[PDB]
Amino acid sequence: FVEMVDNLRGKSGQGYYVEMTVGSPPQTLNILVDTGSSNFAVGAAPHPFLHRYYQRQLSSTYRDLRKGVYVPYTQGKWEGELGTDLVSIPHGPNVTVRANIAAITESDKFFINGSNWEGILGLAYAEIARPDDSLEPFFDSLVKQTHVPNLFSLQLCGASEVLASVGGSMIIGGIDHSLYTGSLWYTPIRREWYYEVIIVRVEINGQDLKMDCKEYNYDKSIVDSGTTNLRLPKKVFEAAVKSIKAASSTEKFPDGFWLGEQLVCWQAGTTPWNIFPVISLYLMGEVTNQSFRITILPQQYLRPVEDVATSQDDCYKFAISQSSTGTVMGAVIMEGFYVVFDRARKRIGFAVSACHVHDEFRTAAVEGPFVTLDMEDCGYNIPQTDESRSHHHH
Ligand SMILES: NC1=N[C@@]2(c3ccc(F)cc3F)COCC[C@H]2CS1
16 A cells, blocks of 8 residues: 555645546546545536646547536536546556546536646545436446455645645555554444434533534534535534634634634744644444544644745634535544545544644544443434435436
């Protein structure tokens, strides 16, 4: 797996990408690693934010599927033509797969200016693939066509004119022991669609938020490398900000900071990290009535941003935000840990990353077990729409 170490790069807040090749001869593209979607989609037409794009015409191995694909999401949209081609990960397993590729022809607020990526690798399940669940995702094709074990793991490492460079590792088909210390704790994958999990308790500086645990998973909780922030449901976000405000009260920040629309600065190397509390998310254990906690530092949820004007100061953005689509454990969360997407055993493993950002006084932690007698079900059951109900699965 040494060949796979440091195979991820990117700019802070703009996503982690892996180099991939598509077609014959191979066209190289930088592809966003996204555990919150299930399509392999690449820029395939000019766009002002793309240096390069996939040219289907240059590939002798390209097969058109003669089917379009339209993908609107909250903040934007992408669309294109479906087809198949030969795909490889140069700094991944020494294999070539025939995979589905959505050739992006038009997009709205999808590509990020300066991100250095031209496509997306959707690593989640067939259930959330577009147009439908018959469009086999890349990982499923990789496992079906090769002898690669059904598991991948992610070590995302966090960091005037440009944004800070980030690095990381995507280990396909295994767990690399030099990327983590201590024990690996597993939480069940609730359902194979997103990488959905269950949060049973939330503590801010060791103080329980005391909400009914279904609120933490309303309407779902997912592990998403494709989202930067820790995103929390409205009521949970409000309680969290109130508690983080209380523990950091000595300093009064503008309302824009808590909304993530304004930076707060301190003289270089003088950031008072100690006034910022740790956040502990307790995840359901493999054993009924057990949980383990993942502990995140302010170094993870206060994202560093270099101000061109005040370069003599350390400036940060609050990287916890409100959600109306449930909890999103984005890169802010993942950056503290080595995360194991054990699809074969339908579970997600967390261990302390060998690369997380920390101080001499506190560390990001993975600790357990924590036991609860007569535990209520913390999972939320999404209201069934007539549309979802009508669907047939053969
Ligand atoms: N995890 C996510 N993945 C998507 C995404 C990530 C990063 C990005 F830069 C653009 C995007 F469109 C791609 O799949 C559809 C939903 C959106 C938003 S959240």
